[PDB]
Design a protein around this ligand. Structure first.
Ligand SMILES: CN(Cc1cnc2nc(N)nc(N)c2n1)c1ccc(C(=O)N[C@@H](CCC(=O)O)C(=O)O)cc1
Ligand code: NA
Ligand code: NA
Length: 124
């Protein structure tokens, strides 16, 4: 069925920016909260940011608040993660995910659909 696909990943110098995008193979008439998570070796996948189905509410993980911005565009059926002031510590595979519930979209188990990930590496 529905496939989420991340793009915009890369290898950039610290202090640089990237903008990730998550596109889907189909549109839904329903409300889906969307989220980004990241995973590095030696770690559990961790929540980074989420946005409610209507775009009005956003939450960020404590390590990225103020530096990253999540936003979504209905006409293009795409969700974005603007990542500024990148640090070495942000290096990870980033995944996008869709959840029918905004509260649980930050839980590892909450989302109903996940992409396969895009790699982001930040060199010092
Ligand atoms: C989660 N998702 C993808 C989805 C939804 N909203 C988004 N919104 C934005 N802004 N960006 C996205 N990448 C995005 N992706 C879905 C989930 C279900 C169906 C789906 O079940 N569609 C049925 C119809 C039932 C329906 O409309 O839900 C179909 O036949 O296409 C489609 C996309
Ligand atoms: Na929008
Ligand atoms: Na859910």
């Amino acid at each position: 069925q529905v496939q989420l696909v991340e793009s915009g990943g890369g290898l950039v110098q610290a202090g640089g920016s990237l903008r990730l995008s998550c596109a889907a193979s189909r549109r839904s008439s329903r409300s889906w909260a969307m989220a980004w998570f990241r995973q590095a070796p030696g770690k559990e996948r961790e929540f980074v940011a989420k946005i409610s189905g209507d775009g009005r509410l956003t939450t960020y993980g404590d390590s990225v608040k103020g530096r990253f911005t999540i936003s979504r565009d209905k006409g293009k059926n795409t969700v974005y993660l603007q990542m500024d002031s990148l640090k070495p510590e942000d290096t990870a595979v980033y995944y996008c995910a869709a959840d029918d519930n905004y509260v649980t979209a930050s839980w590892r188990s909450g989302p109903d659909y996940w992409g396969q990930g895009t790699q982001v590496t930040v060199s010092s």
